[PDB]
């Protein structure tokens with residue numbers, strides 16, 4: 074027969090990690106791999122039908138993605154949706170597909186609300202999620218004996234689609250469930266530097282292990298202000314939640330990175346102000362298969378879409394789409410092998426959840442709730458060179474932290490500071 | 499042929515002005531009238547197909563209305579929608595039907611955002627709108643000479659679907675558009691005895707003509723507190739925006755009303771505190787046809803729905819559905835008379851707007867933008883008896899204020915107070 078895959082992604086705005094400009098080559102490579110293997114959907118042809126998830130301004134919209142999804146459903150009758158990765162379109166599209174009893178694959182839509190599989194039935198997230206970051210932090214605290222309190226700051230910009238709110242919301246919700254700690258939210262406006270005056274006043278009393286989600290330049294400015302306030306590393310620890318490694322030139326590959334230098338003259342102070350800062354990012358797959366997949370993905374993207382893909386940590390999202398589509402194809406193959414049909418949403422989807430799969434991004438695990446178990450990396454500075462590099466790795470399947478190359482976290486005192494001062498608040 | 503009408507309303511909650519329990523008999527009477535008259539759609543058959551606008555909790559939600567609309571569209575292929583009435587359900591359905599190029603009739607959804615016919619194409623509102631209330635006050639200020647400043651308070655309550663917010667938003671925007679006055683928003687928590695204390699402090703330094711949107715009990719409490727202060731009627735005038743006459747036992751019929759009489763023992767003070775308060779409501783249709791329509795609508799509702807309707811101004815919302823649907827049926831009758839078809843949404847809608855119609859609720863006018871021109875009533879106290887009765891009427895079509903039965907507004911000072919006091923704030 075013919076199996077139709079319905080895609081609702083940005084078709085003409087090549088500025089999202091899930092934009093069709095960079096996800097299209099991934100899906101094409103996956104489908105070319107399905108045809109090559111006779112062990113996947115024998116005697117079947119997979120087809121993609123495209124719908125756009127953006128309004129006339131060229132950005133995400135929760136009012137255009139549902140319309141595109143409804144049009145695709147009526148016209149073509151797909152078997153699966155390669156649904157939106159965008160937090161605001163993904164919600165209505167997922168509600169619609171849950172109503173229709175159709176699976177929805179996505180490597181985006183990482184918000185916390187999308188993981189309540191009672192309202193979002195049959196949806197699978199093959200990419201990173203924000204709640205799983207809360208796991209990592211927990212595994213970190215147990216390691217360093219921080220069991221009392223924590224503070225979480227997120228920045229606000231008019232442009233971004235409210236990214237740090239969702240990131241810190243997921244992190245907070247999942248960390249307050251697994252630890253008996255007191256966690257304090259806080260929001261600040263990234264534009265104006267007057268809020269940074271209030272932030273430095275209200276942070277020595279409300280917390281001593283801080284997690285900031287602001288952008289790279291905002292974080293560097295805030296850290297310089299903190300140094301000017303005498304917030305040495307002997308007391309505080311600032312973790313920058315930079316999931317896609319934008320402050321590390323993508324955070325891809327073994328190279329020395331200096332995220333505190335801008336050639337602005339004010340660098341000697343910036344180096345001394347990053348001695349109390351660690352950076353939390355997604356983890357780079359470190360296998361040859363991922364490198365080859367990128368090598369040919371960058372070529373196909375240039376040829377097919379006239380788009381030049383830059384090296385970075387945002388290619389894990391196209392890789393996740395590739396892996397998730399292959400996993401779904403395998404699940405459908407098993408379903409047809411056991412006397413079913415491609416329209417069996419429940420039997421297909423429950424052969425995807427709670428199992429392990431081998432893809433370009435390594436050996437991945439889809440937990441029993443339908444989301445994927447994400448791995449993370451912690452970057453710390455070098456006392457001698459002053460360059461950042463990955464020091465800790467976190468495997469979310471086994472849920473553990475590992476040192477990389479016989480290099481340990483660099484603390485000014487030699488041990489982590491207490492999350493509660495000895496004679497303070 | 500067969501003309502299908504798609505209904506998306508509350509089919510089981512029977513507690514809304516537009517609930518199917520009380521709108522169903524109206525539609526049924528309308529369709530019975532269509533069959534009786536050979537001058538309307540000669541020969542055609544009109545039939546309704548029902549979908550529900552509410553979730554499992556029984557309340558109307560923006561998540562369950564679009565799903566029902568999509569199901570109806572795909573299963574029955576309607577020619578017109580009796581779209582939702584709720585402000586939150588009507589937006590997604592309005593956008594969907596604008597996309598499909600299908601007309602959407604409604605006597606609910608009064609919010610301001612629903613009137614931007616660039617986004618909500620082909621939608622007709624046959625019932626009251628909140629923006630038209632901004633017209634009324636504009637015609638009031640001009641009459642009374644207030645042309646300097648105004649203050650608008652609205653209450654917040656967890657239960658209601660943010661009603662006063664939308665009401666005061668529409669009033670604010672439409673009065674700012676067409677008056678050279680400065681007007682200030684304020685929100686207060688209805689179930690918060692401290693908020694009234696903190697509001698009577700900031701009211702005297704923010705305006706002299708106040709418009710309050712809250713419940714009857716909240717307004718009575720606020721008026722008693724104001725009298726407890728020195729806020730006499732020689733200085734302020736408080737306008738209670740009670741569109742459906744909840745504080746006047748429905749506000750329909752010529753009977754004396756005492757909205758300050760609560761049987762609490764705090765009535766001698768309440769009467770003295772309502773001498774500086776006027777009440778703004780919708781206008782009761784004052785023709786025999788409306789009375790007969792109500793007489794038989796109540797009977798039909800009880801017979802066919804096991805629901806007993808209590809008289810009031812809410813009964814004008816079903817009547818609107820009876821009028822608007824008869825307007826549409828006329829428009830689609832003229833289209834078929836000029837070589838058109840029932841699926842020409844644009845040609846049909848152009849024959850409903852900018853024209854006048856004769857219905858049970860009088861001679862109505864649909865302005866050039868597609869919203870009905872609403873009429874209003876102003877109620878004021880009687881010095882001799884203390885009862886409330888309509889003193890002023892407002893015709894939306896002609897935009898005129900008319901005195902009723904030789905009654906003059908009762909001002910304690912003899913003339914309206916100034917909107918800005920001499921040597922004032």
Ligand SMILES: *[C@@H]1O[C@H](CO)[C@@H](O[C@@H]2O[C@H](CO)[C@@H](O)[C@H](O[C@H]3O[C@H](CO)[C@@H](O)[C@H](O)[C@@H]3O)[C@H]2NC(C)=O)[C@H](O)[C@H]1NC(C)=O
Pocket residue numbers: 085086087088130131132133231232233
């Ligand atoms: C592709 O989509 C992107 C969205 O990622 C559009 O890019 C604009 O991106 C900036 C941030 O990089 C946003 O700030 C901007 O939206 C906001 O901009 C200003 C702040 O400068 C804000 O005040 C506005 O209210 C607005 O919300 C994004 N653009 C828009 C229209 O919002 C980009 O235009 C798209 N490109 C193409 C070719 O379509």
Ligand SMILES: *[C@@H]1O[C@H](CO)[C@@H](O[C@@H]2O[C@H](CO)[C@@H](O)[C@H](O[C@H]3O[C@H](CO)[C@@H](O)[C@H](O)[C@@H]3O)[C@H]2NC(C)=O)[C@H](O)[C@H]1NC(C)=O
Pocket residue numbers: 435436448468469470471
């Ligand atoms: C993260 O942790 C997992 C384990 O916690 C790492 O390795 C995998 O572990 C599972 C068991 O939990 C192994 O099954 C898997 O290796 C075998 O899986 C299948 C099942 O039989 C087998 O057919 C395969 O050929 C393979 O032998 C482990 N994966 C391997 C060995 O690649 C996982 O690697 C960790 N991730 C990282 C990035 O280190």
Ligand SMILES: *[C@@H]1O[C@H](CO)[C@@H](O[C@@H]2O[C@H](CO)[C@@H](O)[C@H](O[C@H]3O[C@H](CO)[C@@H](O)[C@H](O)[C@@H]3O)[C@H]2NC(C)=O)[C@H](O)[C@H]1NC(C)=O
Pocket residue numbers: 510511513555556557558656657658
């Ligand atoms: C029919 O729908 C009505 C809604 O109009 C449901 O009635 C409840 O109405 C009250 C106000 O009259 C709402 O407050 C209530 O929703 C709120 O209730 C509490 C307030 O005490 C608030 O704290 C809650 O968060 C909630 O928002 C309405 N009910 C619900 C579930 O919201 C009524 O249940 C419906 N009746 C039937 C028979 O289905």
Ligand SMILES: *[C@@H]1O[C@H](CO)[C@@H](O[C@@H]2O[C@H](CO)[C@@H](O)[C@H](O[C@H]3O[C@H](CO)[C@@H](O)[C@H](O)[C@@H]3O)[C@H]2NC(C)=O)[C@H](O)[C@H]1NC(C)=O
Pocket residue numbers: 860861873893894895896
């Ligand atoms: C509100 O105002 C309108 C006018 O501003 C009131 O009366 C109607 O006025 C229009 C002209 O603007 C009249 O056309 C209409 O009467 C005739 O309308 C049609 C058109 O020819 C005709 O066929 C009818 O038979 C009727 O003679 C007026 N409506 C009438 C007389 O009922 C309107 O009544 C005002 N509303 C209230 C509640 O007072």
Ligand SMILES: *[C@@H]1O[C@H](CO)[C@@H](O)[C@H](O)[C@H]1NC(C)=O
Pocket residue numbers: 427441
């Ligand atoms: C998931 O599978 C593992 C074994 O493969 C099993 O132990 C576990 O209970 C499963 N969970 C669910 C929800 O089936």
Ligand SMILES: *[C@@H]1O[C@H](CO)[C@@H](O)[C@H](O)[C@H]1NC(C)=O
Pocket residue numbers: 852866
């Ligand atoms: C509406 O119709 C009246 C006459 O019937 C006309 O004067 C007015 O210009 C019309 N407006 C529009 C938008 O057609």
Ligand SMILES: [Cl-]
Pocket residue numbers: 081082083126133157158159162
């Ligand atoms: Cl999207």
Ligand SMILES: [Cl-]
Pocket residue numbers: 506507508551558581582583584587
């Ligand atoms: Cl509704």
